[PDB]
C-alpha cells in the first residue's frame, strides 16, 4: 500500500533530487528509509526481546514528526531567508555536516529551563486546566506538587529540568509544621527523611518507557542565596535571608542522606552540583567547600561549578547573561529553546589540511546555523500564540531567558586530522601550532554568536555538547563520504578525549585556556592514579584546579553494582555477596551504568 | 510524496476490492482516510483551549497502529480458520456490521482488569526493573506505591483499573502506625484526611492529555469481606476477618469526606459502586444499605449493585460480575470487546424475525473466532516479555473473558415494526418482548457453546458505546438512507429520555438484566428531590425486588467557573453564575458540555 504525505512541489523536487545525489544509504543512516514502514518496524520491534510494550506507542511516530519538522523548518526558512539557503539547510542537515537535536520534536516543543518554584508555592498547579488545585499548606502537598510539576514539565520539553532552589522553599514547610505541632520534635529528623525516600525514588521509578525524567539539584552557597533572594519574603512575611543558615543545614542533610542510601540501592537522579564562588586563591563560604570535599570522598558524586563574581545572577528574579550547561549547573532562570552542532571532522576532510580554508568554511557554516535558530524560535512562538504550551502562559517557562545554542564534537579528531596532534611520555598532546589552531576556531564562533544579537533580535549561546548520539552517527556519515580518511568510530566531547592519559596538568592548562571562550559551556574529567589519601590532600587539589581558572569538573572514579543493585568498590558484594555485574561512571558528565549507556549510544 | 507500507499480496487485493466495491467515504468513516496523511493531520490539529502539545504525540499514530492491528488479525485468523473466514471478517469491520473496541490498541495490549493489592503490599514494584523497590513500611509509602501503580497499569491496557480491596489494605497501615507510635490516637482522623485527599486529587489531575484514568471503588458490605478473605491473613500474622468492623469503619469515613469535597472542588474519579446482598425481600446487611441510603441523599454520586449469592466471589468455566461503568467483581476481567450492530440487521431483514435469527446467529459465530484470534496475539506478545503485569501475577489471562457487546436493541426493535405508544407512553408491543426475549436467548446459547468450542468463558454486556452509538448509525445512514432515522443509537433497554412510565423501565430491567448476567446499567432522572430517607429506600428495596442488577439516581449538578458544585442558578460560595453540569450520561458523571 502506497500512502501519501502532502508536500508543496518544491520540495518535493528537492528531496528527489537529493536521493539522486546521495543514494538510498544516505536516507537510511539519516533515520529516512525503511523506519517509516510501520509493518517491518513493529515486527522488528516485537522480535527484539528490559522493555515493554509502553516503549512501542512512544518509538513508532518518531520518524513521522521528524519529517514533518524537517519540512515545516524549510517552509519557515524560504519564507525568511529565500529558497537557496532553506535548500543548503535540508541538505547539511541529511548528509551530516550539521546536528539538529532532538530532531523529532523541533517544530512542535522547546529545549531546557532552570526552574525556581515560586509559582508552585504560590499558585499550585494552575497549568492543568481540568480542575481548580488549592496552594499547599503542609509539607506532604507541597512534595506532591513537586513530583506533578516534574512530571508535567517532563512532557511539554526535550531535555533538564532543572531544581536549584528546590531546599529555599522546601525549609518554609518544615518550619510551619514544625511551630504548628504537626511534627513532633522527637520524630523532626525521621519525617524530613521519609520525604527526602518519597521525592528521591519517584524520579528514578519511569511509569512510560525505561528511563525517567532528567532532573538536577544544586547546593547554593551563601553567596548565592544572598545575592539571589536579597528583598524577597516568604508566604508569612519573613525575610527570606533572614533563614540562610536554616537553609544551609537542610542542604547539608541531603547530601549526607544520599551517599548513606547509595549502599541500599544505586541509582541516577537528581544529578548533583555544588556552586561556589572563588576570587583570588580562596573560598569566600570556606565552611560550605570543606563539608563537600568531605562528603565527595566516599563516592566522587557531586560535580564542582566555580565562579569568581555573582553579578549576573543578582537580577535573576536586555542581552542575556547567565551559565547554560546540559549536564548541570546552569543558573537559576536560564535555558535554551534549541541547540544545532557543527561536525568539526567534516570542517578537516573538506580542507585538505589548509588552515585558512578551514576557517572560511566554519565562518559560513556558522551563519547557516545561526539562521535555522531563528527559524525555530518563529516556530516556537505560533505555538505559544495556539495554546499548546502552557508553561509560558502561567510564567515557568521565560521565552527572553533562553539563548539560541551553537554546539561543537569532535575538536580533538579534527586537529589530528589536520597533522596537529602528538604524544611524549606525559601523554596525548596537541602541538604547538595546534594550540593556536583551536584558539582561532573558538574564537571566531565566539564573534559570530556575539553579531547575532543585533542580527536577529535574542542571544546566542557556545556548548561543547555531551554528544550521546552525535558523536556516533557524525563519525559513520563522514566514514560513508570519506572512506579511510576518516579512521575513527566516535568523536570526543572534551578538549582531550576521555579516555586519554594526557598529564592532569596539561589537561588543567587546557581547559583554564578554553572554558572561558564558551563561557562554562563544558566539563572536565580529572585523571586520578590511585585514590585520595587524605582529606587534606583533596582539598589542597580543588584549591590548584580553581586557581588555574577551571569552571566545572568531576574526579574520576569507578563504583560497583551486583544484580540486587547495592554499590560498593571490588569484586564482591559486602551486603549479600554476589558478584559484580557492572559499574557506574561518567561518560557524558554524569553517572550511569556503562554496559547499558554504551549500547544506547 | 507517496510511503510504502509492506502488506502480503492477497491482504493488498482484499483492501483494494473493498475501496472498488464501498468508496473512499466508507474509508474516512472509518479512520483510514486522510486522517493517514501526517502533514494534513498536524495542521488540522494545530488550529483548533483545553488541549496541549502533550495530546498530539498520543493522537498522531492512532491510525497507523489500528491499520497494523487489523492486519495482523486477519493474518492470525487465516492460519487458524482459513483465508475465506479472515476476509469475511475485515470486510465486516470496514463496513460497520460489527465494531473492534479500543482497535489502534487491539494487536498490542489488553483492555481490563479489576485488581487486588495484595501483591504490592507484599512485594512492592517489581514491574519496574531499573531499580529494585522495596514492600511499604508505613501509611505514606502505601499512597505512593497505590498512585505509582495505577498510572504504570493504565498504560499496559486501554481499559479501567479496578481496586475494589483498597480499604482492607489501607486499614492495616492505619493500624500499624498507630502501634508504632508515629500518629498519637488523638490526631488519628486529620492523619487519614490528609492523606484521602492526596490519592484522590492524584487521581483527578492529568500529567499526559487532558483525562485522568479511569478508576473504580467499591464498598464491600459485612458478608463480600467475611466471605472473600475467610482464613487470610495480614503481614504481622493477625487474621483479616478479626477486623471486619474497622475496615467497615474506615470505609464509612472515605464516602462522608468525598460527599462533603465536592463543593470544594467537583470531579468525577474514582467512580463509587456499594455492593450488596439481598435475598428474599431483605438486604442481609441493613446497617450499611440505610448508611449508602443515606449518604446518596445530596448528589446521588453511588451505583447500586444488587446480588443473591457469595458463592461466586467466595473463591475452569469462569464466574463472576463483569461490567465497564462499575462493580467488577475482585480478580475479573475482560481481554478484548467486540460489538454487533443490530439495526444493521434489522435493515438487512425486511421485516422478517426468522431472517433476523439467522444472520444473528451468524454474525456471533464470527465474532467469536475473532476473539479466539486476538487471545492468541496476546499470548504471542506475553512470551516476548512484553506485559509485565502478567508475568507477575497482577493481571490473571484465566480470569478473562473474550465479551460479545450489543448496542441499539431499541431502534433495531423499531425499524422491524415492534414498538408502540399509548397512555402508559413509549412501549414495545407484546411480540416485541417475545422477539427481544429471542434475540438474548440466541446470543447466550452461542457464548455457552464457545467454552467448549475454543477452551476459554464468554460474557455479553450492554455496552456504554461512546463512540460506536454515534459512528455506527452514520456508516447505516451512508448505506440505507432515509430508511434510518436515528441520528444516534441507544446503550440503555429503552431510551433515556423516552417518555415511558418508570415502572415499564424497570419491569425490563427486571427481565433482561438476568440474561446479560448484570452487563448493564439502569439510571432514573429524577424531576424534584426525596422528600425523606424512608420513601427513597422503600423505592431501592423495590427496584431490588423486581430483579435489577446495577441502577441510579440522576440529579442536575451545577459549577461555576471557579469549579464549586451546588444547585440552582447561583454559587452559594463565591456568588458567581452557574458555567456548565455535571450529569450521569453513559454511567458516571461527567461535564455535559465537554462530552459532545
Ligand atoms: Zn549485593
Ligand atoms: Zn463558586
Known sequence: ?????????????????????????????????????????????????????????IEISKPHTYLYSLYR?????????????????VEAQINGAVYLHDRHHAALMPYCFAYT????????????????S???????????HVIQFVMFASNQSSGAVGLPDFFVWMWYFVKKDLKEGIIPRDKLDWYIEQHFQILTYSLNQPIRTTQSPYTNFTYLDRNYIKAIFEGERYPDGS?????????????????????????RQMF?????????????????????????????????????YISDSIDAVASCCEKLKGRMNSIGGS???????????????????????????????????????????????????????????????????????????????????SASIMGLTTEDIDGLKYTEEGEVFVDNVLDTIREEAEKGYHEYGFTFNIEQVPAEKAAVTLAQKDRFLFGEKQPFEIYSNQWVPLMANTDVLNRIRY????????????????????????????????????????????????????????????ERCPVCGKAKVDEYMRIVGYLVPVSAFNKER
Open 1 to 57: 500500500m502506497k500512502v501519501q504525505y502532502s508536500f508543496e512541489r518544491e520540495f518535493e523536487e528537492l528531496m528527489s533530487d537529493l536521493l539522486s545525489k546521495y543514494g538510498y544509504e544516505m536516507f537510511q543512516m539519516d533515520g529516512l528509509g525503511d523506519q517509516l514502514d510501520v509493518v517491518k518496524f513493529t515486527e522488528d520491534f516485537v522480535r527484539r526481546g528490559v522493555t515493554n510494550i509502553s516503549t512501542y506507542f
Open 73 to 89: 523548518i524549510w517552509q519557515k526558512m524560504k519564507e525568511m531567508f529565500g529558497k537557496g539557503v532553506a535548500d543548503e539547510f
Open 117 to 132: 518554584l515560586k509559582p508552585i508555592v504560590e499558585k499550585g498547579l494552575p497549568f492543568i486546566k481540568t480542575i481548580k
Open 134 to 144: 488549592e496552594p499547599a499548606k503542609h509539607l506532604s502537598t507541597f512534595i506532591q
Open 239 to 263: 525575610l527570606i535571608t533572614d533563614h540562610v543558615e536554616d537553609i544551609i543545614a537542610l542542604q547539608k542533610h541531603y547530601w549526607e542522606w544520599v551517599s548513606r542510601e547509595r549502599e
Open 268 to 304: 541516577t537522579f537528581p544529578v548533583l552540583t555544588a556552586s561556589l564562588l572563588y576570587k583570588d586563591g580562596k573560598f569566600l563560604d570556606e565552611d560550605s567547600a570543606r563539608f563537600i570535599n568531605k562528603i565527595n570522598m566516599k563516592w566522587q558524586d557531586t560535580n564542582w
Open 331 to 413: 543558573d537559576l532562570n536560564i535555558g535554551s529553546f534549541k541547540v544545532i552542532t557543527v561536525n568539526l571532522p567534516r570542517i578537516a576532510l573538506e580542507s585538505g589540511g589548509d588552515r585558512e580554508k578551514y576557517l572560511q568554511i566554519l565562518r559560513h557554516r556558522v551563519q547557516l546555523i545561526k539562521k535555522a535558530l531563528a527559524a525555530v524560535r518563529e516556530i516556537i512562538k505560533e505555538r505559544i500564540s495556539e495554546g499548546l504550551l502552557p508553561l509560558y502562559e502561567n510564567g515557568l517557562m521565560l521565552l527572553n531567558r533562553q539563548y539560541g545554542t551553537i554546539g561543537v564534537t569532535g575538536v580533538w579528531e
Open 511 to 570: 581547559s583554564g585556556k578554553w572554558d572561558k571562550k564558551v563561557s562554562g559551556g563544558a566539563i572536565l574529567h580529572i585523571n586520578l592514579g590511585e585514590s585520595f589519601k587524605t582529606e587534606e590532600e583533596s582539598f589542597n587539589m580543588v584549591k590548584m584546579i580553581a586557581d588555574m581558572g577551571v569552571m566545572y569538573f568531576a574526579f574520576n572514579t569507578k563504583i560497583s553494582v551486583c544484580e540486587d543493585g547495592h554499590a560498593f568498590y571490588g
